[PDB]
């Protein structure tokens, strides 16, 4: 038949764009969600209606507990269960909020920010590999502004730095098994829904390429390339998709 | 009207694969060469037979000198003369040889060739490209190993480092003009002309992903992505196409 | 009075050498240890015999847990309790072992120790150090020069060391308005593993361009000493590799 | 007896502070200069007043041309003829001005910005290494902001990137001879004399640590460390001395 992909947090925003675009490219997909049951279902609906029985949903909480392992195993599972194979893993799901050094308790923050951002990708990676001709690859959602961090976002930043480390080490380690591991690093994309609107323009104006944020589909485009046969020799690479934002000094 | 691209050192090896593949994507192509007259003319005949009036050649020495700006201006001008437009510039041409710090070319010539082709020509070509200015982009052929260099290749490495700087500086500067500037960084690809079987397998053995060098087409694939509509928010980015080679410790 | 420093995992190897050199430069020192009780007490004994009332020990597991914040707070408080001040924090303590992806400690346990010691505890200690400030304040984080060219099957260790880089940068940024500098020291190959054979040692030694030998503990401490000194008063968010060229050598 | 150090562009500003700190440390110094003869002599006289026969001056243009190799050989020679040895080389001299891609000629700009910042350091490095017959080191003055460049500084940035490559390449190659090679990367240091205080403050306010530029002495302090017995294992390292400026996003 046709290849299959798991996308994490695929309900909304960047994950949904990735999901749809993988589908259009001919992937059967698992739409993982935590909170967005509705949205997951609706997207599955839309993809199933397009090609019969090619989109399934999956619940899991990706916080750092004692049960993350099983959850990550569950997610990889259902991809094999629904489609009998798993070609692609997109690590998209992610928490993001400030954690000031001079001031949810901390370990909540750690489980979410370190847990979702780093540890869960590590576990999914381990399951994806464990259960493996083909074109297998993993794509991690990184952050182009990792070296010029937002003030008071240490934990978030630590977790994204950790994700670069996983990208590198897993690319090395899984290269023998023909599994590629890559990253996509957005700058400013879909801005926080809560963040002010006139405040949003402030950020848009800093971006060299067209004074605007990346659309979700732009991010998705890079993911598509990395999983494709056009990237068959690409592993351990992180592709920034930031419109030049990371090149701009203070 | 199909867009137009200049590829430097497009007569052989990776440059040829980039020109071919731009052509197969719908571009008209200026094939720059220095010495490889026959291969140059040969390729253009092949492109033109495939689609008449779609390929030209343009001879130029890319060694640094007081007339390199005029030679660079001429390469770009050749594209406007042939095709009435210049949409893409691929900085591919490259001198590569050892320049030990501790002891037939003079050092003046070594600097001219290694710094001229790898860095100064790209800069002058970028300047000419932007001056004569849809989906405009420049792709620089960089080097994935530039922070773990070959022993005794200081001038080469300096040139490739300079090219990274050019990639970033021009991406920043040319963004408001809608011109994107990116790089592709091979690890080990098409291997040298003068090298034994034993030595090839030595290098190949180092590559985590499949224990082999990149095909030129694999390198060309990333160039294709960067110039395409799928990369319209990507600028100042360098994509490693190295099979994990740069991840491998001594 | 004399400034005070907290050094984590300071009973042996690189931490001890850092504690010793800070002590010789006139610091009062907290020697944090986990398991190495005899060795920590021995070191403090030596340092106290050198100038009385200048060295204390402090026991803490730096494995991630819900009590890890309390333990890190307690480490910092030990310094204020002993010496009335805390000028320098060195995050040296580190777990180091393989965690293969394609496969005995549970994975829960691996994550707790490798991410906890190498990254979370540094963050918590960073927080406690800064909050307790109410001179030349700085933090030095022991990083790893080979993080972008890692050992096969050391995913979690590498992830923690990359996190520590992120902490170094983020904390340099956030704490600079308080006058606290935050930097890193990144060894290549230094003191080899106690359980490693001399045969394997020489394999690693011969890869080092500068001298074909590992860094001495002193040489690593030397860089730490520079970063805390007034010769580094404008330096923050910098990581100095002390690796003999090792990270420049290709495969 | 006393070790000897060559410092380039040592007449004024940062190179001056380095010469002085090296002298105070016990070094005999060659004060290289291009135009500031008056400045160079006064420094030399003052140093020589502190300690007889410990300081000499040497004039040379470090621009790129067929005579540059000879010039750099002569600079190194001047240390040996004066002091009988050359233990340290500090590549400090630098040209810095904008070179927009869109009243000097372009070839002149290339010659000056690539010549002073990259090529002359390479030639000096070669001459330093070849003339050796303990604690030998080279320190290259880099730039902490090379990945977040000033707009329209492409050539400057290319030169500073090249210098990073030299540092790394020469570190690797000279390590067997026991010559360490490292860099110091200032952020904002001595601001131009004639720059308005109101402008100066715009840059000053960007700096996290103390909201001021680095003194020349602070930069020199990092140089002193790298040449010292405390840095005996450090090679191929670049120490940013930037007060956190490079960590600050747009
Ligand atoms: N937005 C931007 O501008 C930038 C984004 N990025 C990165 O790109 C990726 C996508 O960003 P964006 O779409 O804005 O992300 P969001 O912050 O909106 O989160 C995306 C999804 O993550 C899931 N998620 C969050 N926390 C958990 C958790 N504890 N367990 C399980 N799932 C969880 C949610 O799924 P559910 O809805 O089902 O609960 C949510 O829809 C992230 O990795 C992010 O860090 C990086 C830099 C810039
Ligand atoms: N091959 C590999 O494994 C790797 C290559 N790269 C990079 O990828 C790109 C393509 O590599 P590859 O195809 O191997 O390159 P080649 O070594 O085959 O050279 C490409 C072309 O550069 C041209 N060139 C050389 N000197 C001059 C000069 N003075 N003036 C004008 N043109 C000149 C030549 O044109 P002509 O033949 O007409 O004289 C030559 O065919 C380069 O920029 C290279 O640095 C990066 C790392 C790995
Ligand atoms: N040695 C080398 O070659 C290199 C070292 N580094 C870094 O340099 C630093 C020093 O290296 P090195 O001296 O070899 O380190 P070690 O591996 O010897 O560990 C130092 C100390 O870490 C402490 N530690 C370990 N696990 C825990 C834990 N769960 N809770 C609390 N403390 C713990 C131990 O204290 P105790 O003995 O009391 O149990 C130990 O003595 C480390 O951060 C390391 O990663 C970087 C690269 C190379
Ligand atoms: N100051 C700052 O904020 C920053 C500086 N840096 C780097 O720090 C180093 C020192 O900085 P700074 O003191 O401000 O530098 P300056 O701009 O003051 O230049 C230092 C010296 O360079 C010499 N020089 C310039 N062009 C030439 C040439 N063609 N031939 C020979 N010598 C030449 C001059 O010698 P003379 O006067 O005798 O002609 C000059 O005094 C440089 O390498 C610089 O790039 C990096 C980032 C920031
Ligand atoms: N899960 C999520 N992770 C992230 C990470 C980053 C952002 C984000 O909005 N980043 C922008 C940082 C930035 C920094 C400086 C200038 C600008 Cl215009 C933008 C948003 C999100 S949402
Ligand atoms: N114009 C050209 N530029 C370059 C640059 C690099 C190479 C090359 O062969 N690079 C491989 C270097 C290498 C470094 C370490 C391990 C391995 Cl297997 C290979 C070949 C060329 S040809
Ligand atoms: N807590 C500890 N952390 C670390 C981290 C790294 C090392 C170490 O020995 N790293 C060497 C890795 C290496 C990789 C490639 C070549 C070589 Cl000569 C050495 C040893 C330790 S002990
Ligand atoms: N030879 C010389 N090289 C350089 C390099 C850089 C500078 C300089 O002024 N750099 C500051 C760049 C900068 C960029 C963005 C913000 C801020 Cl406050 C400062 C000044 C000089 S003088």
UniProtKB/TrEMBL annotation, chain A:
It holds the Pfam family adh_short_C2. One of its GO terms (molecular function) is pteridine reductase activity. The active site is at residues 143, 156. Transmembrane segments: none annotated. It comes from the Eukaryota. This is Pteridine reductase. The modification Cysteine sulfenic acid (-SOH) is found at residues 58, 72, 150. Belongs to the short-chain dehydrogenases/reductases (SDR) family. The gene is PTR1.
From TrEMBL, chain C:
Keywords: Nucleotide-binding, Oxidoreductase. CDD domains: PR_SDR_c. NADP(+) binds at residues 12-14, 34-36, 61-63, 92, 94, 157, 161, 188, 190-191. SUPFAM superfamilies: NAD(P)-binding Rossmann-fold domains. The active site is at residues 144, 157. Pfam families: adh_short_C2 (PF13561). NADPH binds at residues 13-14, 34-36, 61-63, 92, 94, 157, 161, 190-191. GO terms for molecular function: nucleotide binding; pteridine reductase activity. The modification Cysteine sulfenic acid (-SOH) is found at residues 58, 72, 151. Substrate binds at residue 138. Belongs to the short-chain dehydrogenases/reductases (SDR) family. PANTHER family: OXIDOREDUCTASE, SHORT-CHAIN DEHYDROGENASE/REDUCTASE FAMILY (AFU_ORTHOLOGUE AFUA_5G02870), SHORT-CHAIN DEHYDROGENASE_REDUCTASE FAMILY PROTEIN. This is Pteridine reductase. It comes from Trypanosoma brucei brucei.
């Amino acid at each position: 038949e046709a290849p299959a992909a798991v996308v994490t947090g695929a309900a909304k925003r960047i994950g949904r764009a990735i999901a749809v675009k993988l589908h259009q490219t001919g992937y059967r997909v698992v739409i993982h969600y935590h909170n967005s049951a509705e949205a997951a279902v609706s997207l599955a609906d839309e993809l199933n209606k397009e090609r019969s029985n090619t989109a399934v949903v999956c619940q899991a909480d990706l916080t750092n507990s004692n049960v993350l392992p099983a959850s990550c195993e569950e997610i990889i599972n259902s991809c094999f269960r629904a489609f009998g194979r798993c070609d692609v893993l997109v690590n998209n799901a992610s928490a993001f909020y400030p954690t000031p050094l001079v001031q949810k308790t901390v370990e909540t923050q750690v489980a979410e920010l370190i847990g979702t951002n780093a540890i869960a990708p590590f576990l999914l990676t381990m399951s994806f590999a464990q259960r493996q001709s083909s074109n297998l690859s993993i794509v991690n959602l990184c952050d182009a502004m990792v070296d010029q961090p937002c003030m008071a976002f240490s934990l978030y930043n630590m977790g994204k730095h950790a994700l670069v480390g996983l990208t590198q080490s897993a690319a090395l380690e899984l290269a023998p098994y023909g599994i590629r591991v890559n990253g996509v690093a957005p700058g400013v994309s879909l801005l926080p829904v809560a963040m002010g609107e006139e405040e949003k323009d402030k950020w848009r104006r800093k971006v060299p390429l067209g004074r605007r944020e990346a659309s979700a589909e732009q991010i998705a485009d890079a993911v598509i390339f990395l999983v494709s046969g056009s990237a068959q020799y690409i592993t351990g690479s992180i592709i920034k998709v930031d419109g030049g934002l990371s090149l701009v000094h203070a």
